[PDB]
Design a binder for this molecule. Structure first.
Ligand code: WFF
Length: 258
């Protein structure tokens, strides 16, 4: 809080990079075949543990604490699949140059796994998002800021408890992205073009993530019949999220209008 301390303290993007979650293992069971039942159960277990890290992350995310508890909860529950998908795309980009879907070091999907998981087309759509990371040569700086924008990209139909505090936080992070692209237009030429590409990429997540969620809601509802395991963390999120999304109580915020 000191004057000197404030002027010198790591910038907001440096803070985001510092609080980026550690590596999470899926705990892949080599004794089980790669069937939908086992792959999806493994993805769900993995995602539960990643979501625990996401909550820890959100806890020290600057600005997030300034929202009401219920809005914080609401935002994590609405954006969870966007956050996991984006982080997946990043890992896939960094570890495999977006050739494969790197869910964890012990769970990397090639095309065969994509089929086996019963979400071939969804995995291919995500892989295609990851290919954009290669085209753009997305940077760690862009990634971290964009991930925050994803946390802040889906809200209830009639908005949040503290809509103004949310909008302030969202604007603040959009501004960080603006600053970043002004400094570093990277391979898009002009800073405005960089911002356009990055925000279009974010908008392009919505339909894929919505499709991912529909499958997740289906397997959740039919969990016992399908033998698809969900951990408590996902049970909690999906039990709250599913009726809201399915009843239209959901509003995606697009950077660019349809
Ligand atoms: O039971 C089900 C079926 O619907 C699901 C849909 C998605 C997931 C998760 C993803 C994921 C994200 C992007 C993709 F392209 C493929 C993905 F699998 C992730 O990264 O974490 C969980 C898990 C289930 N679980």
């Amino acid at each position: 809080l000191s004057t000197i301390s404030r002027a010198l303290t790591p910038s907001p993007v440096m803070v985001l990079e510092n609080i980026e979650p550690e590596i999470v293992y899926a705990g892949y069971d080599s004794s089980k075949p790669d069937t939908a039942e086992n792959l999806l159960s493994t993805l769900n277990r993995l995602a539960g543990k990643q979501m625990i890290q996401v909550v820890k992350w959100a806890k020290v995310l600057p600005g997030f604490k300034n929202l009401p508890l219920e809005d914080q909860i609401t935002l994590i529950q609405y954006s969870w699949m966007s956050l996991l998908s984006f982080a997946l795309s990043w890992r896939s980009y960094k570890h495999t140059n977006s050739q494969f879907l790197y869910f964890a070091p012990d769970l990397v999907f090639n095309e065969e796994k994509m089929h086996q998981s019963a979400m071939y087309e969804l995995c291919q759509g995500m892989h295609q998002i990851s290919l954009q990371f290669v085209r753009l040569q997305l940077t760690f700086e862009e990634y971290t800021i964009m991930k925050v924008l994803l946390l802040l990209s889906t809200i209830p139909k009639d908005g949040l408890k503290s809509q103004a505090a949310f909008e302030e936080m969202r604007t603040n992070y959009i501004k960080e992205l603006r600053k970043m692209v002004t400094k570093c237009p990277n391979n898009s030429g002009q800073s405005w073009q960089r911002f356009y590409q990055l925000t279009k990429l974010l908008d392009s997540m919505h339909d894929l993530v919505s499709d991912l969620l529909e499958f997740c809601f289906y397997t959740f509802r039919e969990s016992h019949a399908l033998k698809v395991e969900f951990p408590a963390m996902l049970v909690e999120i999906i039990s709250d999220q599913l009726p809201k999304v399915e009843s239209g109580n959901v509003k995606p915020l697009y950077f660019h209008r349809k």
